[PDB]
């Protein structure tokens, strides 16, 4: 019994984190095979980050301008190139701890584990979701750039996020491991605002199924609803629309608990209008939307890696 | 208020 | 900015997790040097779990009765002994992934990361706290026994918890790495029950300081309180009493924020009386009590491992 | 209610 916000084991990712330093600018890098990946703003000085010209800044740098430290060992940089907002540093040594991995760009509403790192050393891991506005509500300080987010699919590490910057609201923005930004953001120190954030509706329902599995049943009711009726109420409360694919994906939890998805939606509609009746669900007074349906199946069935 | 590129400073 | 329920990177513990099987009973083991630590009830079968005589059951056991598997390699057991409720199996090979480690016993209110495992394989990592009733609110299924709780402050892994069993309310009980149970619980499947759980007050105050550090101030007020008056209020909400030691513990956070401890206590009294009234504190509508003052300074000031 | 020792079952 019990339900916690579980992150993936970070051992395979920990063995890939290195430190990259260009001048006095330092951050974290991802050492996979014979290439180190890191945010391109490592070539920026403090005065450069207002309106950087990365194409020009990088052209003034050579391989010797990059200090890559993997622990107490410096990796010789034998090449450098820019792919979108990520810098690729070719080193003369393949990482012996390179795991089975791939680069995957994730969809908003999906979850992943963040391995926050400072000076190339992992310091903490936490589970989070990619918000519908393509921000991450993470915990990041200066020097945390280059920290990576990942999933573990079967036995393969799926790198999906690399940290770059913090937005003025305190939320965070980054790219995939191919350098493509999540959301309408650019890596420079200017005024930037994220779009209106909504609630990942399918995740709330999956989380409500996890509560039923753990014995929380008070929010259930005799009523059902329709997708159109729910979506009309959901959009008024800044909730993402529920699709037929969301319903099908919730199928395993619908059959295991004996509560149809539209029946759960009726409970969710009620919780949006009348609140939570002064009660809690799974030890929370909010509607938690950082558990995907597969996250609930994973935790409740004990899937290992 | 501007966004912050969350690299670090390292005295060399 | 931002505040997350951060666990420690689990890699150093993953390299020590093995599967221990005795007869038909299987659980997880902790492989450090040439010793494997596991819960002693691995030697019970189905009908020796109500009132087992562990000293007697172990005497009937031989080295070849313990199947220890580190991945796809079967470890050869050359000795076995029992220390309280933990079993110690001597193998002929020292774990090459053995980290610099330590055995510590913690007090209620202390936090640690849990690496939930099944059949010797990691399933997930999450953060949790030793509740005042000496239980933990984990996420554990059958086969999760042997999973360990730990902290990795600085370079050393401090093992503080080994999981054993689940109590009727869905909370969990276990021992330290010397086999000594936390609380008055025993590794028998007899009728057991946790006492009334209370809120860790010093942790709530530390988490309110973390909110102030992160820029939240709507919950502060102009009032102060005496320690006795705050305590007389706190017990009315099943909060743990605040001792003078706890007041000293919150000293550095009080100095960093410029808010006296008893000042923060007055705002805690108001929050208990009012609720949050549609607002959230660091992304929660409940007062979080699983962050120690140490955790707050760790996540907000300097993070490294 | 009885406590539950959370070991697992394994076929021999």
Numbering used by the authors:
A (entry chain B), C (entry chain A): 1 to 305
B (entry chain D): 205 to 216
D (entry chain C): 193 to 204
Show sentences the authors wrote.
Given that Mpro processes the majority of these sites, any intervention that stops this process, such as an inhibitor, would block viral growth. The crystal structures of inactive SARS-CoV-2 Mpro, with the catalytic Cys145 mutated to Ala, with 9 substrate and 6 product complexes were determined to sub-2.5 Å resolution.
We used 12-mer peptides, P6-P6’ (with the scissile bond between P1 and P1'), in our co-crystal structures. The binding mode of the C-terminal residues (prime side) was more varied, especially beyond P3’ position, and lacked full electron density. The sidechain of the conserved P1 glutamine was also extensively coordinated in another hydrogen bonding network.
